[PDB]
Amino acid sequence: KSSKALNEAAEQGDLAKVKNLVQKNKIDLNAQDETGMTPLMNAAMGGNLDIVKFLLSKKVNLELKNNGGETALAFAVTNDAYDVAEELIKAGANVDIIVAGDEGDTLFMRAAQNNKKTAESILAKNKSLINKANTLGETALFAVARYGTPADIDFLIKKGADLKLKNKKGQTALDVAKEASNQDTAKALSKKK
């Protein structure tokens, strides 16, 4: 059975409260609540690194998923808890996962738009994720083409991004840059060889 009190303390960043419930050890730390959450997911979503470290020391399962299909690592990345994300990746969390939303963005894609260090950590575990497409046929190059910078494009190219991919609408990354009125990435992508 899940503990509502433990899950709340874990999200809120109350480590003392977490230690006072977990060491009493009436709680299965892998038990999931009514929306599929675990303590670890709560700690990750709340960016609570000390609590994540404490739960990792109890050898909790890293790969359980909530109703949105997200593991703790997905919660961390998507809530910009990149210190937590680094901790989870070093602890062996699967990086080949999908974050919530209609697009089915890869974890890598989400990190690529936002935190270079974690994007690099993901690729260090699986080089091919650079070109793994989402449900709509788009890679990180497409996301950065719309909403990123020429430097972001260069980062992705430096990591092996394929320039010729088309999404499920038949669009290239250059096509989507133009469509999103990103003059700087469109100019840059037009010239890439």
């Binding site: 303390a9 809120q12 960043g13 109350d14 480590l15 929306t35 959450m37 997911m41 979503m45 709340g46 609570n48 909530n66 109703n67 949105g68 299909g69 997200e70 997905a74 919660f75 990345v77 998507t78 809530n79 910009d80 990149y82 974050v99 919530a100 939303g101 963005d105 989400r110 738009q113 936002n114 935190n115 270079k116 950065v144 719309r146 909403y147 990123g148 910078t149 972001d152 999103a180 009125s181 990103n182 003059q183 700087d184």
Partner: protein, 401 residues
Amino acid sequence: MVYLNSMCHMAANSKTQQIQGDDNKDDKFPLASISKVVTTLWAVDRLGPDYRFKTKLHVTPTANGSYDIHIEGSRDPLFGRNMSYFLISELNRMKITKIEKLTFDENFLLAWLAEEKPMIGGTTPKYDTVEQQASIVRATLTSSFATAISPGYYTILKTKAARIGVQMSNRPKIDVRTISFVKKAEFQKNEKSTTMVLMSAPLKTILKRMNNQSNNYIADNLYWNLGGTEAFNAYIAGKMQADTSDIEFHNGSGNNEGSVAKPVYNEATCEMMIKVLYSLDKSLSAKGYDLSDVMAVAAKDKASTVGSYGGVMAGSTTAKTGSVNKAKTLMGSVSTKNGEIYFAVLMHTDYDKSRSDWGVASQQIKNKVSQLINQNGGPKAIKYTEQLPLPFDKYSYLTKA
């Protein structure tokens, strides 16, 4: 489920000051912690960005080489562990190591974890009697202020302090025998006492820390200090000719003041958020400051909730986040090829049905702000160097009044 409630924007230099956005820009929605930008404006207007909270210590020598000290509080809203460590370092610098009687009044607010989890994101304690507040301050003085200083937390602080030019003791230690509450109206300063002042960092710094962390404790205490909801309603009516239909606050932080059964959230219109940004910018500019002096800068303030706001926002965008059950929000300014543009994005979420909604909404917000930047010629880096906001600075040293 995630969808937009409203988004609006306005160029800072607009001649008409017409706010652009959708048809819901004049409808109230939950703000979550973008509420803190409204509290920031109120504090900047009422106190000024250079205001310092002047905590006074009334110090009297005693027959045995110790001192009696009465703390005349200032309602400093960032007085916890780290300010206490600085105060202890300062007492030691003054050769004060033993305090016989330590007393304090009802304006001495002390919350050890003021800058730490879980107070950053928690329900700020609201003391409904002075006696309740004083009982808890006395307990914190006894169990934290007067006991062995954590070497790890102290050295982290001392290193930060040195980076901003502040000296601290290597081996801080105080002994306190008796601690008690003495109300301001009942305090009788000794003829032999000396009044020393411990000034906070300026308000802008306190605000920067609050808006980097999304610190509920700081925000709620500022709001209460300035008179709470009755005073806020009067302020905003006089400032904006606004009423309850435009903005309805119950606290300074934005978090839920009721239950999960019956929630009570600060709400306002997207238009009101733009007006708040315009007014805050105006008040700061009068003193030579920018929004980046009190609000976090995407990708530059690494120790903020926007430290990983990448893409075209990085280095161009000054913004405050918010997250509650039914909302994910962002407001601030973007610096573009075309100039400074104010924005606010109010999303709907159902975090209680699906905890993944915050992350989904967050990236949708980032993409909407990035689109706004794209449509104004791309980003322009603001002039900004990452700040290190502490509760004290080089003018906080204990000094005779």
